[PDB]
Design a protein around this ligand. Structure first.
Ligand SMILES: CCCCCCCCCCCCCCCCCC(=O)OC[C@H](COP(=O)([O-])OCC(O)COP(=O)([O-])OC[C@@H](COC(=O)CCCCCCCCCCCCCCCCC)OC(=O)CCCCCCCCCCCCCCCCC)OC(=O)CCCCCCCCCCCCCCCCC
Ligand code: HEA
Ligand SMILES: CCCCC/C=C\C/C=C/C/C=C\C/C=C\CCCC(=O)O[C@H](COC(=O)CCCCCCCCCCCCCCCCC)COP(=O)(O)OCCN
Ligand SMILES: CCCCCC/C=C\CCCCCCCCCC(=O)O[C@H](COC(=O)CCCCCCCCCCCCCCC)COP(=O)(O)OC[C@@H](O)CO
Ligand SMILES: CCCCCCCCCCO[C@@H]1O[C@H](CO)[C@@H](O[C@H]2O[C@H](CO)[C@@H](O)[C@H](O)[C@H]2O)[C@H](O)[C@H]1O
Ligand code: CUA
Ligand SMILES: [O-][O-]
Ligand SMILES: [Cu+2]
Ligand SMILES: [Mg+2]
Ligand code: NA
Ligand SMILES: [Zn+2]
Lengths: 513, 40, 75, 258, 102, 72, 49, 227, 44, 56, 70, 91, 143
């Protein structure tokens, strides 16, 4: 029974559960790698070794946080649990293929940890640029195991994207148009389209890298008439959509959380929210070379990428102002999930704004490959993607489990993590303006005060992560079973009870025209 | 939300135990490695 | 002569082809002038420009390949 | 249930497929770095077993158990279109690499395309024959489709056999062209682009031909009805995709790149 | 217009055979708006409560008038002042008279 | 209809294949191999191949594919 | 009935704040951390050549 | 170079870096103002017991939502692109210097007249002279004439590097097989520091750049002495 | 299959102290792994 | 060939509780056991190969 | 007796008042920031360079022993 | 030129059930959107079910993006909590 | 009034200031005296006692608006506990400093910093605003 249920699953909720457990475990690995980075940086000098061990830890930090924590939790975990429920569907379109999207991830993660165990690791940066990642400067298996790890993660997400798009398009009640689906469901469908189109270009690029390393191709090797800059274009053609992939499900969750804890039946400006997500998705494909402003492209190209990147602020602004307008007039419930979402609105706004500073090529010359970039992306990742994950986890935990968290503990957890992430990343703006480079194991002495403070903030965030594990333990330990949930008339996923039965919507909803 | 009282209440002492075990599971193994870095 | 002037053919940050073209131009002029027993001094402008712009290892490699018979540009 | 969707029996093939992907990738690592093909051959074998049993079960579910209602078939249509879109974007990366390298040939190549020392194939010889072959196979598979819709078993089988024959002809011609080519994958970016882009296309021709062969044996066994034959539709959509990729390879790499 | 809005709501609550579902739908809809309902609307709702033999809902309506005023402490005592004749006629005790403000 | 697509298959498509097969047959036969020149952008070797002696491409043809050191 | 916060909130807030301040002030000042503050208004420059 | 507890950019050594400071001031004022407005509005939405929970009409307010941000982005892009094109403008350099990145040090070639080239390595910590800066000094500085337009050409002979000098507003990637151009003009004599700005392996943190700006006549005699 | 709170999970919540052990091993293994990998790379 | 689909419909619709991957009979069990043995055995061998490759 | 207070639109009235107040404050902050940061910086650079003597600065540095080349 | 089975001949299982039901104008597997009645207490929307409760979603007005969801139980007609539209279960 | 897990699909009771009249009464089952009180409620409410009026309220509703809207002392626990755990964090930092970190570079010695500071002033580091601008070259002292 246990094997049939948990290894042979064809059930969207159980597969969702498997993704949430996998993502939680990957978060711990990512948090440990984060602490190693900030332990190295937290006093001047050398703690672990030279930049090779250091950048193995930095590279693995990013891969684990992105591919093994955020994507599995948001898309595999919240997506699988919530999407079918929010459209009244009995499962995903391809419920068996869904299981393979999950089971590809343990092997993908195994390949990543093998990459760090063999030789000297892949100390490349998560971008894996050649020639440092090539067979001369990174001889041996590490970078090939990294490539294969990304191949498996990529297949997992492409098949998942096919599953989501098909499910969302094809499995709604016959009366429900796309314009009567919840915003979370829209956020997943758009994320899935981005996956579908972007991952195959990454796959092409890393396969070229593999062949340069093992089959004597020279895609990226000037000796054969190749170009390291071509690899950058192929990776970033993926990688800019990838950050929109990381945020969009978060925007969908935020919309639900803000609506719910404002006591509203609906988000403000639904069709503007849909327009804003599809506009962000579309714009996200035409801006990639803002990661390349220092490579030597033509001025007119830099002027285009500056301008197209800035455009993104307009739809994103509509979302932020619509969240504010959803709060407006609310009967506000100061829940832990509401606190996460209010932190997300503000801190994501600050990170988005530092992204707008970066979009200016002329200024990016001085900011590129410095900690100012690191400050921008951790405001939108540790204080944006992660704040939406935490808000969605504490909001839907009683749905998934049938048990309640201790809200006082969850508010304490929010307060500690809020202090820790701000302490960690706010001072990195100063490091970046003043010229500290990225991917350094040590720094000139002038940079000591802000590095020290930033490392102290990383320890506060460690305390928050340990406390979250206790909080989950205390909820399963205590067994406070849910009774009544408010606002089920506009939150379909709760209407089957907590947790819902294995099979839901065996009899579909009735919706008339 | 509303909920039933705990089926298996976790007393302050039991919560101190859980919290202490949780923290130690993170801190001891990492502590042991970082203490022994020089040895490595 | 101070350094290589701005060349409207090569107005962008990527100056690779400016180096390459001037190396070719020098060596093509040198072959033309030596063939008839002409004077290589007429080729001097291309020599100064490629020497200004071109990395020493690129010139050294290209010179080796011209001697080896493996230079892939037309001279 | 009172919906029309398919609740699938719990299945081991997702896990065997995922483990086959671990074995193939760790096996390629073992082959490239540890001089051994053992893990790779286990992975390829488990991958083939997984594919066989999974698609076998899809046939059982549909032809033999009746779970493919119109709503389920509509989902499978979207799934196959979206899969083909992902495969288009995979080849787009290889075309981008080709145009990048050939539009701006570097000094190492001679600053020219084709590079100094490269003697391209004549696009009017076997590449033109390969073009006629895959275009003809698009005509023959369209005949097969209309024969099946019209209830004509013998002509469906004849047309689909001709389509497969042409795919096999293409594969054998391309294998011969690979052996006869005076340039190799190690011949700089020209060899790299040529062999990786045409080589992934060749793999896709082999996959598409295999899919058509499955459809041939299913038709021999009377699985398809005149109105219900999504496996054949999907194979034909995939086969048109393989033809269109070839036309873009022919115009780009063989003709314009010569 | 304001007078038109108020008249619609007075008419709604004044329907002689208003049922319990309609009373609750009316009050639960009304408190969604950016206003404290005019005494005349509240009078009509309280008289509906009387026709529906529902004393408790009359008291709850007085509580939600106070709640909708937010920090504007002047509104509720004004509304109670305007309603005193109806409260006396129908025997409706205020929440304060029942200790339900504690 | 089926009849029209069979008419196209046998009346246009397969004749075209037969004409291109003729064209290829006629232009086949071995063209003289060009002088070996050890160009550095060709015969790339940054890692031995994972088969044979490490120095032969996968579909090495001795008649037309020189090694880095020239024709066999 | 008074809840956990009514009974222990004052003690938790007072003891928490007191602990936090004392241990951060100790860590900041008593264990040899180098903060590397600005020399401006602090360091008397000394001949180096 | 950077100084302890620094909050903003290193002081400008070049006119273009001055321009970048005033453009950053302009843009940061906008960033502050928008962040502050969002935080204030959050606090405003969360500090009243008044409620309005019925459906709200969106189209009026979405015109403000989109037009005002669009105008702000134009007000950032106009000066942004002015500086981008100023940087690109034709200037007529007096001198061309090349730098080649390596694992892990920079080489410099001054080949307009004579074959002058040398390597430039970090000074190990244990060898610093009293008063010298940890991780920033090099054995052989890149001596250059002050108040003159210089063409720098940047490449690599191995992996990627990137050649940066913050106080001059410079960062140009070092890519093997590529020759990237930037222009350098110091308003002042002095010593101007930067650090490798593309991950390049074991000693990425330890291959700095030191420019040493002096009058032309000193540069000419140094050049002659380095042959 | 079993339905309801505590049954729709691949781990047991029947005993809160066995659960604490399992959760400790689970999260603690993920958090420890990078430290042991660093140790492994340093001992080569 | 003759159309024997109806006989396969009867076999695969038999009310015997078997999942679809085993419903064809004993051959299905053999092929499942071979597949799963090669997968699990191969995975253990991959882990052995990692242990080996993790040291010089 | 108590006067009839305003009973309608209290949320909207509060919003109008505070959004105007936020506009007026944003204008105050842009004026302060123009003065305390941006103009301060323009004036610091203009004042530094107005009578700046690059050769005198070089001679100071040279006499301090800073240069390899002088 | 024959030999290909028809759906009439060879469709089975649920596919056959759906195809025979459509021939009779019946929708037991909920492929079609039901058409609304006037929704009054006298003319309620009739909601088929195989059990004694079914979830309704009410799109109260054409083109509303918000759907109102509730369980409809066997017995007296119930009203949408947003628009008051009446629904009555028919098990 | 006992709410049961198996009741999840039935109309339910909520105390919410934005949903004043919930879908069900708080108490549905009535004793003999409560049945008599609901009969009395059909007569003039002027004849109900204050106690009877409160009992009718409490049958219909669980909490009053004042009760459901009450403030709590929870902020004190949250803030104090968060400060505790932030304080605990400093213990981890003290441990790290004592057991993990070795000595920092010799360039942070007081005499090194005093010499480095002079050399930065001699090379006029940041002379417009940042650093040397804060030194008085005429008085040989910080401004
Ligand atoms: C809980 C979390 C814990 C906190 C984390 C640790 C924070 C560290 C404390 C910083 C204090 C530094 C200090 O000594 O300041 C004294 C410092 C001494 O004055 P100064 O030497 O004349 O420096 C002023 C510079 O000239 C000013 O010009 P400049 O060129 O030197 O520098 C500009 C610079 C300086 O910018 C700042 O000072 C940032 C403002 C501080 C945060 C608010 O840096 C930035 O651009 C920072 C980028 C920030 C990104 C956008 C942030 C959005 C703001 C959110 C607004 C929300 C409402 C408020 O005074 C300040 O400016 C106070 C700050
Ligand atoms: C979730 C992740 C995420 C998100 C969503 C974003 C969002 C954006 N990012 Fe970011 N970014 C990263 C993750 C993310 N980024 C990562 C990981 C890197 C580093 C990659 C690597 O090198 O490793 C990076 C790098 C990075 C770069 C390259 C810098 C460099 O390497 O030198 C740039 C360049 O333009 C950039 C810009 C932006 C912009 C403009 C947005 C926009 O989408 C932001 C839009 C948001 C707002 C503007 C705020 C809300 C708007 C309003 C309140 C309306 C009013 C506002 C205005 C008028 C301005 N990002
Ligand atoms: C008839 C045409 C069909 C050809 C197929 C035949 C055999 C191998 C399969 C190829 C699959 C396609 C592409 C893989 C890469 C390279 C092969 C390219 C095609 C090919 O066969 O190229 C040959 C080289 O093969 C070599 O190196 C051999 C390489 C063998 C191992 C390849 C390594 C695998 C790469 C990993 C694939 C990653 C894909 C990930 C999926 C993405 C996730 C979404 C060319 O022979 P040559 O002697 O150099 O020149 C001819 C001289 N007379
Ligand atoms: C040396 C080569 C090794 C490489 C590995 C791959 C090699 C071969 C793979 C060949 C693909 C064979 C696919 C066979 C699918 C058979 C099942 C099928 O066709 O199932 C059909 C549904 O389609 C469905 O699932 C549609 C299922 C379609 C998916 C297939 C597309 C190809 C996938 C290839 C893998 C990608 C590799 C890309 C490399 C980058 C069943 O429905 P019907 O047909 O309507 O029947 C019902 C009627 O009888 C009722 O009256
Ligand atoms: C980034 C995450 C890490 C955060 C910091 C963690 C805080 C450390 C927790 C405690 O860790 C322990 O510390 C002990 C010292 O206090 C070590 O004992 C060591 O030191 C003792 C004192 O000398 C000896 O008695 C022991 O034998 C010896 O192993 C012990 O191994 C280690 O497990
Ligand atoms: Cu060189 Cu980093
Ligand atoms: O990518 O931002
Ligand atoms: Cu980007
Ligand atoms: Mg860079
Ligand atoms: Na360090
Ligand atoms: Zn309705």
């Amino acid at each position: 029974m246990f094997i049939n249920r948990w290894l042979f699953s064809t059930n969207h909720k159980d597969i969702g559960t498997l993704y949430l457990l996998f993502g939680a475990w990957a978060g711990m690995v990512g948090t440990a790698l984060s602490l190693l980075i900030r332990a190295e940086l937290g006093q001047p000098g050398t703690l672990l070794g030279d930049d090779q061990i250091y950048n193995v830890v930095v590279t693995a930090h990013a891969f684990v946080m992105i591919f093994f924590m955020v994507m599995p939790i948001m898309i595999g975990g919240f997506g699988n649990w919530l999407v079918p429920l929010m459209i009244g569907a009995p499962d995903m379109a391809f419920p068996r293929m869904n299981n393979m999207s999950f089971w590809l991830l343990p092997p993908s993660f195994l390949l990543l940890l093998a990459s760090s165990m063999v030789e000297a690791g892949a100390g490349t940066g998560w971008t894996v640029y050649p020639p440092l990642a090539g067979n001369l400067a990174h001889a041996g298996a590490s970078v090939d195991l990294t490539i294969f790890s990304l191949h498996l993660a990529g297949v997992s997400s492409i098949l998942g994207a096919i599953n989501f798009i098909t499910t969302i398009i094809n499995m709604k009640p016959p009366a429900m148009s796309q314009y009567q689906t919840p915003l979370f469901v829209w956020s997943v469908m758009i994320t899935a389209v981005l996956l579908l189109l972007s991952l195959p270009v990454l796959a092409a690029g890393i396969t070229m890298l593999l062949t340069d390393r093992n089959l004597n191709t020279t895609f990226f090797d000037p000796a054969g008439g190749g170009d390291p800059i071509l690899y950058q274009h192929l990776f970033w053609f993926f990688g800019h959509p990838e950050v929109y992939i990381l945020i969009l499900p978060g925007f969908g969750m935020i919309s639900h959380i803000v609506t719910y804890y404002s006591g509203k039946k609906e988000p403000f400006g639904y069709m503007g929210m849909v327009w804003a997500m599809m506009s962000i998705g579309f714009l996200g494909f035409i801006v990639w070379a803002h990661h390349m402003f220092t490579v030597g492209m033509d001025v007119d190209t830099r002027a285009y990428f500056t301008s197209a990147t800035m455009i993104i602020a307009i739809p994103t602004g509509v979302k932020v102002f619509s969240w504010l307008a959803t709060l407006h007039g609310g009967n506000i419930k100061w829940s832990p999930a509401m606190m996460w979402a209010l932190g997300f609105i503000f801190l994501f706004t600050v990170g988005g704004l530092t992204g707008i500073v970066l979009a200016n090529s002329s200024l990016d010359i001085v900011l590129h490959d410095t900690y100012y970039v690191v400050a921008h992306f951790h405001y939108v990742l540790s204080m944006g993607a992660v704040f939406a994950i935490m808000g969605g986890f504490v909001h839907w935990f009683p749905l998934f489990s049938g048990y309640t968290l201790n809200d006082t503990w969850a508010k304490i957890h929010f307060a500690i993590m809020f202090v820790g992430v701000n302490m960690t990343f706010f001072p990195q703006h100063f490091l970046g303006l003043s010229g500290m480079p990225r991917r350094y194991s040590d720094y000139p002495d002038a940079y000591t005060m802000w590095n020290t403070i930033s490392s102290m903030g990383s320890f506060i965030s460690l305390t928050a992560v340990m406390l979250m594990v206790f909080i989950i333990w205390e909820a399963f330990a205590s067994k406070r079973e849910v009774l009544t949930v408010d606002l089920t008339t506009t939150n379909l996923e709760w209407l089957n009870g907590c947790p819902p039965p294995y099979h839901t919507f065996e009899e579909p909803t009735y919706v008339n025209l | 939300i509303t909920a039933k009282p705990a089926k298996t209440p976790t007393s302050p002492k039991e919560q101190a135990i859980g919290l202490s075990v949780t923290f130690l599971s993170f801190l001891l193994p990492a502590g042991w490695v970082l203490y022994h870095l020089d040895n490595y | 002569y101070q350094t290589a002037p701005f060349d409207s053919r090569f107005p962008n940050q990527n100056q690779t082809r400016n180096c390459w073209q001037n190396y070719l131009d020098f060596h093509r002029c040198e072959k033309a002038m030596t063939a008839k027993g002409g004077d290589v001094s007429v080729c001097e402008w291309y020599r100064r420009v490629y020497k200004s712009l071109c990395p020493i290892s690129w010139v050294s490699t290209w010179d080796d390949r011209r001697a080896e018979g493996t230079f892939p540009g037309k001279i | 249930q009172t919906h029309a969707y398919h609740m699938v029996n719990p299945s081991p093939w997702p896990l065997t497929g995922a483990l086959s992907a671990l074995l193939m990738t760790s096996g390629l690592t073992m082959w490239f770095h540890f001089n051994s093909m053992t893990l790779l051959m286990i992975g390829l074998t488990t991958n083939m077993l997984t594919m066989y049993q999974w698609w076998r079960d899809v046939i059982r579910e549909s032809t033999f158990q009746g779970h493919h209602t119109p709503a389920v078939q509509k989902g499978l249509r979207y799934g196959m279109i979206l899969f083909i879109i992902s495969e288009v974007l995979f080849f787009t990366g290889f075309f981008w690499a080709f145009y990048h390298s050939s539009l701006a040939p570097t000094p190492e190549l001679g600053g020219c395309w084709p590079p100094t020392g490269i003697h391209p194939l004549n696009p009017l010889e076997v590449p033109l024959l390969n073009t006629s072959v895959l275009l003809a196979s698009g005509v023959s598979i369209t005949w097969a489709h209309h024969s099946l819709m019209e209830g004509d078993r013998k002509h469906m089988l004849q047309a689909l056999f001709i389509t497969i024959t042409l795919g096999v002809y293409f594969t054998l011609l391309q294998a011969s062209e690979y052996y006869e080519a005076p340039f190799t994958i190690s011949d700089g970016v020209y060899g790299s682009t040529f062999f990786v882009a045409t080589g992934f296309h060749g793999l896709h021709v082999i996959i598409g031909s295999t899919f058509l062969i499955v459809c041939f044996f299913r038709q021999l066994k009377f699985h398809f009805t005149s109105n219900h034959h999504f496996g054949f539709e999907a194979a034909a959509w995939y086969w048109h995709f393989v033809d269109v990729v070839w036309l873009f390879l022919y115009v780009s790499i063989y003709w314009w790149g010569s | 217009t304001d007078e038109e809005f108020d008249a619609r709501w007075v008419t709604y609550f004044n329907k002689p055979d208003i049922d319990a579902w309609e009373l609750r739908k009316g009050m639960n809809t009304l408190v969604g708006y950016d206003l404290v309902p005019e005494p005349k609307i509240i009078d009509a709702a309280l008289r509906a409560c009387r026709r529906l033999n529902d004393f408790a809902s009359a008291v709850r309506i007085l509580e939600v008038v106070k709640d909708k005023a937010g920090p504007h402490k002047e509104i509720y005592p004004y509304v109670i002042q305007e309603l005193r004749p109806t409260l006396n006629e129908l025997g409706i005790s205020t929440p304060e008279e029942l200790g339900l403000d504690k | 209809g089926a009849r029209t697509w069979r008419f196209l298959t046998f009346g246009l498509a397969l004749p075209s294949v037969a004409l291109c097969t003729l064209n290829s047959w006629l232009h086949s036969g071995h063209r003289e191999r060009p002088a070996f020149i050890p160009y550095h952008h060709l015969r790339i070797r940054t890692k031995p191949f994972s088969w044979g002696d490490g120095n032969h491409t996968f579909f090495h043809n001795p008649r037309v594919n020189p090694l880095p050191t020239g024709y066999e | 009935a008074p809840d956990f916060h009514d009974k222990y909130g004052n003690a938790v807030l007072a003891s928490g704040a007191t602990f936090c301040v004392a241990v951060w002030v100790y860590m900041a000042t008593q264990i040899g951390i180098e903060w590397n503050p600005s020399p401006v208004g602090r360091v008397t420059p000394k001949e180096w050549r | 170079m950077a100084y302890p507890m620094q909050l903003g950019f290193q002081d400008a050594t070049s006119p273009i870096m001055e321009e970048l400071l005033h453009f950053h001031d302009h843009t940061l004022m906008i960033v502050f103002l928008i962040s502050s407005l969002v935080l204030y509005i959050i606090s405003l939405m969360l500090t009243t017991k008044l409620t309005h929970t019925s459906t709200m009409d969106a189209q009026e307010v979405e015109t403000i939502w989109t037009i005002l941000p669009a105008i702000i982005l134009i007000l950032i892009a106009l000066p942004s692109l002015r500086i981008l094109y100023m940087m690109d403008e034709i200037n007529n350099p007096s001198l061309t210097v090349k730098t080649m990145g390596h694992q892990w040090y920079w080489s410099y070639e001054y080949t307009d007249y004579e074959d002058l080239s040398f390597d430039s390595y970090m000074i190990p910590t244990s060898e610093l002279k009293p008063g010298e800066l940890r991780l920033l000094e090099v054995d052989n500085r890149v001596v250059l004439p002050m108040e003159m337009t210089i063409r720098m050409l940047v490449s690599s002979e191995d992996v990627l590097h990137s050649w940066a000098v913050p106080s001059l507003g410079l960062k140009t990637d070092a890519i093997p097989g590529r020759l990237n151009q930037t222009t350098l003009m110091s308003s002042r004599p002095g010593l101007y520091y930067g650090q490798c700005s593309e991950i390049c392996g074991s000693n990425h943190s330890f291959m700095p750049i030191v420019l040493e700006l002096v009058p032309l006549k000193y540069f000419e005699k140094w050049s002659a002495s380095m042959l | 299959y079993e339905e309801g709170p505590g049954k729709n999970i691949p781990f047991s919540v029947e005993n809160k102290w066995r659960l604490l052990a399992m959760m400790t091993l689970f999260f603690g293994s993920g958090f420890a792994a990078p430290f042991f990998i660093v140790r492994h790379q340093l001992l080569k | 060939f003759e159309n024997r689909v109806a006989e396969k419909q009867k076999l695969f619709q038999e009310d015997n509780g078997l999942p679809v991957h085993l419903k064809g009979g004993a051959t299905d069990n053999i092929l499942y056991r071979v597949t799963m043995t090669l997968c699990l055995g191969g995975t253990l061998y991959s882990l052995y190969c990692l242990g080996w490759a993790s040291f010089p | 007796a108590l006067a009839k207070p305003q009973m309608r639109g209290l949320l909207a009235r509060r919003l109008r008042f505070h959004i105007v107040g936020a506009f007026m404050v944003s204008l105050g902050f842009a004026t302060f920031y123009k003065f305390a940061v941006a103009e301060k910086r323009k004036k610091a650079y203009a004042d530094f360079y107005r009578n700046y003597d690059s050769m005198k600065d070089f001679e100071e540095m040279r006499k301090a022993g800073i240069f390899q080349s002088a | 030129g024959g030999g290909v089975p028809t759906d009439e001949e060879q469709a089975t299982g649920l596919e056959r059930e759906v195809m025979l039901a459509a021939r009779k104008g019946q929708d037991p597997y909920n492929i079609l959107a039901p058409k609304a009645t006037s929704g009054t207490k006298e003319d309620p929307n009739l909601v088929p079910s195989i059990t004694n409760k079914r979830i309704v979603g009410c799109i109260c007005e054409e083109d509303n993006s918000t759907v109102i969801w509730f369980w409809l139980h066997k017995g007296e007609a119930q009203r949408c909590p947003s628009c008051g539209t009446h629904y009555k279960l028919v098990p | 009034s006992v709410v049961k897990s198996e009741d999840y699909a039935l109309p339910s009771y909520v105390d919410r200031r934005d949903y004043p009249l919930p879908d069900v009464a708080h108490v549905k089952n009535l004793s003999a005296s409560q049945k008599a009180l609901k009969e009395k409620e059909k007569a003039s409410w002027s004849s109900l006692s204050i106690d009877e009026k409160v009992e009718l309220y409490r049958l219909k509703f669980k909490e009053s608006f004042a009760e459901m809207n009450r403030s709590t002392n929870e902020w004190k626990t949250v803030v104090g506990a968060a400060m505790f755990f932030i304080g605990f964090t400093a213990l981890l930092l003290i441990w790290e400093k004592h057991y993990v970190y070795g000595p920092i570079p010799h360039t942070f010695e007081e005499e090194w910093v005093a010499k480095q500071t002079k050399r930065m002033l001699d090379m006029k580091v940041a002379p417009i605003q940042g650093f040397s601008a804060k030194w008085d070259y005429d008085k040989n002292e910080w401004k």
